[PDB]
Amino acid sequence: MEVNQLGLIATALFVLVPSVFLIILYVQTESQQK
Amino acid sequence: MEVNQLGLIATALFVLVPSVFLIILYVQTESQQK
Amino acid sequence: PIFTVRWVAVHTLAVPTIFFLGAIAAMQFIQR
Amino acid sequence: GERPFSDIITSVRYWVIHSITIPALFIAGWLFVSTGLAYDVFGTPRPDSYYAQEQRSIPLVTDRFEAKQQVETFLEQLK
């Protein structure tokens, strides 16, 4: 299928950028003193 | 120029995946009790 | 006779070196 | 635990021994070349032995397992 060639990078960054943001925030919450 | 269409996603993930790994480790070190 | 490791190591290098240098010296007088 | 080299090479005994052995080794190496023996031990061409008089082609080895006999043939074609 003749799909848009930017669809792959668009989808990849759409997932990765906000997911990474949340993982960064989660891990540094876990590492805080309990 | 007729570049390889996967070169963009390859470069983006090559940068993003290990950089994010290091950012995760750094931030959760900073947040640890001092 | 009393030979040591150092003595042996010295001469394994030194003895061929002098022989080779005499050979290479002689070669300087070979003409085609 | 061994004597320093500087003590050894500044002693008379060292130089009595080596005033003979060093020149002798030098002369033996000289003769190894000047008698031509070095050519025949190692198989190195003399200046007149790279080419036959008529041909101007390299005696390159082309046969792995009969290379020894191939060199022996290239050499017989010289004289």
Added chain:
Amino acid sequence: MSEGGRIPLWIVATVAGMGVIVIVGLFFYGAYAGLGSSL
């Protein structure tokens, strides 16, 4: 006979160095004469 320093090290070094110079000088002479001289 085996005592160190009977022959002063400065003389050993000078003669040995002159020997090195002579033999290396001979090799440079051979670059201009006989085999390898291009002539």
Added chain:
Amino acid sequence: ARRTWLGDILRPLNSEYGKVAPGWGTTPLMAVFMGLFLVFLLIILEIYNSTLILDGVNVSWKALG
């Protein structure tokens, strides 16, 4: 630590940590086998390399000579 049915069965097989035979033990016999193994590897290397050439062993895709 948690015991389990399968863990109780496997217990003997993980029971002799640190146990040794005295001294050199079977090291001499081991050295012989290592020596034989080295010669074996040298043989198959030299066959593959055509340094060792054997009757009826044509090291080629083709089986002729």
Added chain:
Amino acid sequence: TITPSLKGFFIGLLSGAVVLGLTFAVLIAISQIDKVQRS
């Protein structure tokens, strides 16, 4: 049958064993005559 290269293989093998055997026999002999002294 024993081909020329198999004969060569045995020659190389025996040659290597001789080199190694002589080396160790000598080293062992030297180490036995020239032992370290301990308190």
Added chain:
Amino acid sequence: GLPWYRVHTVLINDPGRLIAAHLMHTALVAGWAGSMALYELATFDPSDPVLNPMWRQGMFVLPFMARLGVTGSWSGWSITGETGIDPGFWSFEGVALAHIVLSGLLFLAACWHWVYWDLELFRDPRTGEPALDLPKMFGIHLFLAGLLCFGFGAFHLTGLFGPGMWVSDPYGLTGSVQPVAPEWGPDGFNPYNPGGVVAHHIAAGIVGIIAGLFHILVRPPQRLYKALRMGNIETVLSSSIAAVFFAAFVVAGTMWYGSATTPIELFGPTRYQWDSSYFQQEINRRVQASLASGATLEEAWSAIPEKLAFYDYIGNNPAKGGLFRTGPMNKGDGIAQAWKGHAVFRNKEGEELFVRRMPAFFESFPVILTDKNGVVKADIPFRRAESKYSFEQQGVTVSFYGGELNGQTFTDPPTVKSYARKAIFGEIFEFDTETLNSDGIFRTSPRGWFTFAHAVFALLFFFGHIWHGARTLFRDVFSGIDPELSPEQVEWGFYQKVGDVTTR
């Protein structure tokens, strides 16, 4: 805290979680195999094992399934070009499915072993500390490896209970999976004899069973236990990495030179078959036998199988690629469609001329034609002002025998020169360059890519061996040397024997 390059050392004293991590690694590798096979099946064209076999299509795991007897698809085709075959469950798809399911089961087992790490099995009954009896584990695992090795050889490879293995004729024309009997004579050590592969697994398997039993029953000598640090699991990592880089060099070598386990219908021809003109000699042998039997030249060359001519073409040589020229060979010269036939060049006097072939070393190569004695008779000049051998001056023509162009003769110099440029590559083919938008630049085959990856990984694993071997033998100084290191233990003259305080 732990630096980033040491995070996994938390497993060293935790056998249950080490097992969990090993389970997870095993799940990932099995999942890779399954997903790789599915991707290949979604991209593989099975319609032409002659001019579009798997090794032209960038297939990497398909040849390993085929090597051991998986050759059919549930959709009805086989890799030898058959139709209407029933492979049963163990088709390419069934293999992929099994690996995916295995992956999930291993993933679940990893979770269980991670949570329930504190099993009594992993504790030394005397000390209560975590303890693995590594010498006995070695015997247990060696015995199991020997049994599997033996059974693989005795049942699978023989066809006694299993499919056999891929075998073929010396020119890779008629390959198929066959049962193979073991070869117990010296030719079993011939890498090109498949019977030696069968005998190896039978004999090494038996040896592995015997040595396994020895290693189950006989404790290590105290001298070896101490010297190799057999209480330290990192010693096992060191020597295992060594064995693995040895194996990796071996599989790189047999892939590059060829053996009975790297057949050319599965991985493509070798570079040495081009170097030695292996296929050209066989083609000429057949042509000459046809001619000696009264065939015409057209008949003699028309009797040459397309598959044989295709091996005699440098675009299939694995030493013609590039590190960043990615994908299948078809992406370069195209999807091969048909042999054009054998080009015979002649000058105006009618003498047959031969195009000098390109060696693998050369990205580009001149066009030079010689007679049967090697005398130059024509070429394509660079500077024209002093040209003596141009196709125009020499009246060079080209005639084709066999293939698409059988019986045709070309005399137009640009056309003759165009075919001469293809002849430096060997036999000449027609390609579909449109379907994949092929760029005309040669790529290597899976034979090349396999060899590269495994030689590189092998060399890198040498560093891993050295590193973990050092950490094993120097564990006591890994955090630094004793703060009050005796100056007499490292200076000269104090000790007779280096590192022995009792020889002061």
Added chain:
Amino acid sequence: NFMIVFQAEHNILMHPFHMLGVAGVFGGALFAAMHGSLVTSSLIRETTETESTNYGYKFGQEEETYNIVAAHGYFGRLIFQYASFNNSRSLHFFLAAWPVVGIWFAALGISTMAFNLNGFNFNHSVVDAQGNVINTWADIINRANIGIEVMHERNAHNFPLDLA
């Protein structure tokens, strides 16, 4: 491009100042690895098994962080005793001097080939009894140099010698 043309026009590989340059950078890399490994080899134990050994040194501490006598004892046995530095000032002067002098000579190589005093030319230096040239590896270098020479700046020369 600069390097390849330079080789055809000056035979820089056969120039002894470029050879000294190579010894400078090969030797500098070697001595960096050597010095780095010897100091790292003899760090004094100041950390636990968890943390990086780098925490065993504190910026500005007065005491040395490794045992230079241990380091010297290793290296003097690796080669022989008097081949090893026990003087840290001599050692670090050598580390400075070797690459610096090597690169000085490299730079002087380029700066004197700038005036066309070029690398050694042994083209056809070996001749047999009749007068046939017997090629050496120097002659194989010359064939590569010629290939570069005839191809470079392929539209720029009208006359037979490339004199600059």
Added chain:
Amino acid sequence: MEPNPNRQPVELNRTSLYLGLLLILVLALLFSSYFFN
């Protein structure tokens, strides 16, 4: 569950972040041309 005593905190200090990002970005600057080809 009872706590696993083999766990350890992990650390990456700021200098190591800067060194690692430099390594990654420069490797990317180097290899990107070959990925685009």
Added chain:
Amino acid sequence: ERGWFDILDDWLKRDRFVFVGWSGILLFPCAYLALGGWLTGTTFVTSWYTHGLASSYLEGCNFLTVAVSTPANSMGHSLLLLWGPEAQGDFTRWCQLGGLWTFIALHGAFGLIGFMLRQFEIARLVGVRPYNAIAFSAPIAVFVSVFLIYPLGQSSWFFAPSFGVAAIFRFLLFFQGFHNWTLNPFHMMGVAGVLGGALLCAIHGATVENTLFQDGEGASTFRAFNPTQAEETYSMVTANRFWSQIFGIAFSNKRWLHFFMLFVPVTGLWMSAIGVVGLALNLRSYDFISQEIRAAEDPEFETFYTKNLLLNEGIRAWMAPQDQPHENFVFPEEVLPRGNAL
């Protein structure tokens, strides 16, 4: 009553002028034969039958042009043992066939193994961590990839490097013309590690020498150091401030500094070895496909990348007939690529 193995261990590890060790049993014969083989071959042995080349002092070569050259291409990857099927025990023929090349390569390989083992053995006896051995893995990776893996991927040992000064220069230019090796990013990382290592060597030595504390009265400052002293001989604090203000960053940790001096050249050599492993298979970084598509369609498009390929094409065409004599190349004058006039 001690046991012969322990008595031998005692003697092997005696503190003597030249340490022997168990590792010396491998190291000393193999290093000596590799070095002795090279001196013997470069002094006396020809390359006429393998290469069509003179290669020894005896023939008239000098130190820059002598070599021990690879065997003829027709030997393949033969181990070329003296007693093997090619020389059949004939020492003279063995030399003429190139046996001294595999002699030197293989004794050299096992000698390098012996040396790394020596590094481990001495470190263990003296009680230091074996980082010197670990750093030496880089020379080993280079030797193994260049002198063993690379020819093993090619047609024969003939295309390995020959052991000589000019022979090695020829190897460099061959790799440019045939592999475009300068374009390879693994070679580029190697270059960075070597030049970066030399940079670290110079800057660290210079920094120490110019932040010394005055620990004596002499204007020559080497005498003001004592190996047993506890104190640093130079100021880390002043060095750190200097480079922070000059360059923007500076070392502050002496341990990291010295590990980094190992890491940089060792990693660079390891990367170059990986690229050569690719070149064993002709898996080159030879071209940029997008550049070739554009230049083929647009005869006004030119870059330094296309300019260097023209040089490579010149190298291949003009050096191959004499450099690859087993190919019997005859390239008529009219087919040789060349620009105007030259």
Added chain:
Amino acid sequence: METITYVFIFACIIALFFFAIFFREPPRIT
């Protein structure tokens, strides 16, 4: 898109230089 990629990576490197110098971990004597 390839020019953007190259210039983007370069720009990230220059930014890293800025943070590595002016927002470094301060060297501290202890």
